[model samples]
Target: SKPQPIAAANWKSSLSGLIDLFNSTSINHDVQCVVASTFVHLAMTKERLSHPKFVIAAQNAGNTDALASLKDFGVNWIVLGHFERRWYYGETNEIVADKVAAAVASGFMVIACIGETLQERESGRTAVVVLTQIAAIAKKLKKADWAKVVIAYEPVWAIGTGKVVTPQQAQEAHALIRSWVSSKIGADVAGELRILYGGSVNGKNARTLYQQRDVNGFLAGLKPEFVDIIKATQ
Candidate 1:
């Protein structure tokens, strides 16, 4: 299967520009957008109004209650367990696992993010940390639920810092993750799973990152150049 790149727009203000960007672009591949919860309704409205060729995901989601609301608004995807949610908001692996269960139960495709901080990486615990996070969610998910999940490996040190893991580093991490999944579940599921890189990804480096075998795609922040990154995958 081909890799599916995602452009996540965690905007604090209006989504007018994002709407315009989607309208103007001629996207024809596997790409999507993740917007803030507050803007989902408007974003969906704009998506219907303009008919962009992509799906929109919610940046964060809580419990079953929030999942129901999001479903009512026609949201089919949700991003859970991001670094900020774990760092500043006190969302432990257990809590994120709960949310993942809720979202999957609600029939929402999940972008479950897992990664280690700079300190953890520097201390040679990146694999241990990420595995712990993945284990929590894996315990809560059923065999069938794996089909709806996409693992996004976003190293905490690289996110929004203009720093990115080298293609070799990214490939190593992604391959580790895929091997873990295969051990936990099965080889078929792991092979079909999409592991996206989400650390300081831009159009300039997207091609190199996508060239890696285990690096299926990207989860990028909103930028004008991101369109090129999306194009790079196709």
Candidate 2:
């Protein structure tokens, strides 16, 4: 069967309310749910879910040690190199590459994030910058490891800044990245890859964004209290 599109939510606080919300009978539980946050948050949610259909993902696996801890907690998915960690906390591409390798080594599925900053966009280097990051990983990772990676391209400026990437801009970037993967990494791997768009993604805009061919789903941040995120999948 075709895989149901996955919607991975990034949460900082408790998700007990949200978990209960998902368990409601009216909700469509087809789409896989993954939570990405700090290790403590993952721990708390893991026990609550008890391996519910939804899985736990780490927002930023800082090091190999952290990845190991998540493994112990039954966390399987992890988002590496979030914009906040890279832009605000000083995580460089080299560092991200290291974490990616470590996560793969430790048996964790990684949401490898890559995107352009405001300055990079202004310089008209969005595609180049994004592709460069992907190429870096393409070179480092074993060909067989492609199935373990999920790429989330979150244009830095649009993340929580109220500024959003236009549908046209998002489609163009996603298409370009898809081409890059097919050309750089093999076509089979590219076909199996899931490329996600992040940046002020909500119900209204999510419909349009999800319309894009390569946009498998989203990595939502700063979600509104009223958004029935589970509804989006239905």
Candidate 3:
């Protein structure tokens, strides 16, 4: 079966105007919409939404307060354990599992990010490191909780460097993750999980990555406007 695609728009205030522009372009695809937001400001930011297609997301679910607030707004997805959080804030796999368990208990679907830094990539430890994080959380999760998780592999080296992971690389990595989930959790759970690719995903590479067997969607960082999202789909 082909996986469904989701488009996340991580745009700043300056690019907020482009949402209307993007929505005006008449692209009627069935992709889910995710917007980045923080807990302190989510209410003010999402109060004016009139469209059902767009789903607001908590950018960083660092605290339980934020997760609770996001859940109050009926937001289903969250971007957890991003690279900067792990690299700069020292978020370990244990901490990430806490967040995942908290978010799952609160009825929020988690977009758990696991990836290697440039040094780790160069050292050929991508798989080992990524798998370690995945296994940790997989062990902690209940069987039902696994259904609410989406694993995103965002190679640190490619994040802002304009070097996209090749289709083969993305396929290889996602396939490996699938195997990891099966081995760690169970074969049935792994088969239904959606694994996404993140790290500088844009118009040029979105389609190919979306077409890959285990590649379900993308966690994008740049946007000319919401209109550009339609172009990405094309």
Candidate 4:
């Protein structure tokens, strides 16, 4: 079966912002809505606004030991090595690979983020950078491990800058990601893998982007506007 489309909210540190967003959103099963509040809010968000398809996720984790309480807190999904983590926190591919491997072993679904910076984008090394990121995670995981792994294609320049790739750029990038994964695991296994478009994604452009063949879903910007993005998928 093809993977279910996911709409994740990485609500960095905004508890007040997410409370308002949850009030407006009617999360459903059709599009898997993953809400990733800051660590402090994960448990409360899940308890207060639980829904069949409203999945709660963690922004990131350092090690398997840190993940011991993930299930206890009701966070089933985890995002690792986001651009903020790499650029601001100095998380490398090796660190991300280990985190991904550890998160999966802890029985949590993982979104291993991969992306290129503005300089890399301008220098024409976008493909190399993202592939190298994915390759690092691949080296740590074996077959069947792909089942719990989702790849979030983050365009670092577009994150919070309100910039976006053309529709064709989004399609081409997602297609390339799937193709790269197919080469490692078979095409069939890769086909089932979900590739999420992250960064500056909102209601305005989400429908067209989701319509792209390999673009299975999104990691949306925070706030009530994200509901429209979720609604658009249906």
Candidate 5:
């Protein structure tokens, strides 16, 4: 069976206001919802939102102690291996895998990001790069750990360059991921794994993207109408 569509809000430092804003918006039972915020805002953000459908997430948990502490603040989810983390901070594949291990070990669910840069995509190294990213984390996890993870494919080219990937491109990439997982991880995990599109996924584009066979949900960026995107996840 396909997993439910996850409408996750990856609140970069700028979208702190979304905590209060989304609390009152109606929830969509068809969508599994998550809202992430910066470390400093997580506790406060968690405390204010009472919606049962909205799971709170920490944007980054770089250390074991910090990862452990997040659960106490009501953060059940963790976002690891963001392009921002990989590029701006120089987080290597192994390092992202290690953080994923620490978070999973600490009993937190993770949105594990895997993607290729513009050059990597232009050079047609998308499969090689993304699979390499997945391999690092797959080696670190137990069979059960895959259940606590969501794989987000946010091409850096699509995110930074005002470019949009057609549904066909997104589906092809997610299909590649599923096939690789089937071969290397197992067919069961690959079938059940929820692969999300994470770039330029907003209200206008969500429905079409969601229609793609392998596009499971979204790790959506800043949007003016998050509820509309949630609605589109049908």
Candidate 6:
């Protein structure tokens, strides 16, 4: 089966002009636009204005209560355990797993994030760190619940640092993640899993990144060049 390619935009602030630009643009591929809770109403207002190519998502879901709020606003997707959430808000793997469980139980598609920091990577603990994160969610989620999940691998060091991982590096991490999924679930489910890359992804490197076997798509920030990134996968 072909991978369901997606370009997710995590908008932390206002989408003022961006929403109008997105509404006017005709994208050939699907885009998930994630916004903060404060902007959910704004997203809802612009929801019907944009083409169907765009779907709204929530940046975080604190609990089932938060998921309920998102569901009310017509958000079907939510990103959990982003590097900022983990680092700034003290979200451990356990906490992220709990959130994943809650989000899925609430009927939201989960973009569960996992990654290692520069220090952890330099210490050769990237695999250990990421696998642990995956295991936490795997243990909490039922076999059937895996259907609604997508994994976003965003290395903390690379995120917002303008340091994109080499295609080889991204492939290596994604492959490892798939193998871990196979171990926890089954090869069949692992084969169907969508593992996306994050961390300073842009038009210049998106084509190469998309060429990797396990690199399904991307979790991108709001940028003008994001248009090219979406086209790269298509």
Give the C-alpha miss distance for residue 189 in model 1, angstroms: 0.6
Q: Which whole-number lDDT from 0 to 100 does residue 179 have in model 6? A: 93
Checking candidate 5 for backbone clashes, the offending pairs are: none
lDDT of 3 by residue, 21-53 (tens): 444545466666677666665664476544566
Question: Tens digits of per-residue lDDT for model 5 on 118-201?
Answer: 989999999999999999999999889998989999878786687778878989999999999989989988888999888776
Deviation of model 2 at 231, angstroms: 3.7
Question: TM-score of predicted model 6?
Answer: 0.90
Best by the lDDT measure: 5
Each model's lDDT: 0.76, 0.73, 0.72, 0.80, 0.83, 0.78
For candidate 2, what is the TM-score? Answer: 0.89
State the TM-score for model 3. Answer: 0.87
Give candidates' CA RMSD values in order.
2.5, 2.5, 2.5, 2.2, 1.7, 2.3
Quick one: ranking by TM-score, best first? 5, 4, 6, 2, 1, 3
Clashes of each: 0, 0, 1, 0, 0, 0
| Candidate 4 lDDT | 0.80
Native-referenced Cα lDDT, model 1: 0.76
Judging by TM-score, tell me the better candidate of 1 and 6. 6
Encode model 4's per-residue lDDT on 1-234: one tens digit a residue: 157888787877556556556665575548787877667776678667656667778887755666887866656789888888999998999999999999998898998889888788889998999899999999999888999999999889666666768878877888889999999788977888889888676677888787778887888766777877777675
* Tens-place lDDT digits, model 1, residues 134-206: 9999999988999889888887977556665788898888999999999989988898898888777678788
In model 5, which regions exceed 4 Å deviation?
14-17
Off by over 4 Å in 2: 1-4, 25-29, 50-52, 160-162, 222-230
TM-score of every model versus the real structure: 0.89, 0.89, 0.87, 0.91, 0.94, 0.90
lDDT of 6 by residue, 85-203 (tens): 89888898889999999999999888899999888888999999999989998889988999899899997877556665788898999999999988879988898788888877778
lDDT score, candidate 4, position 197: 86
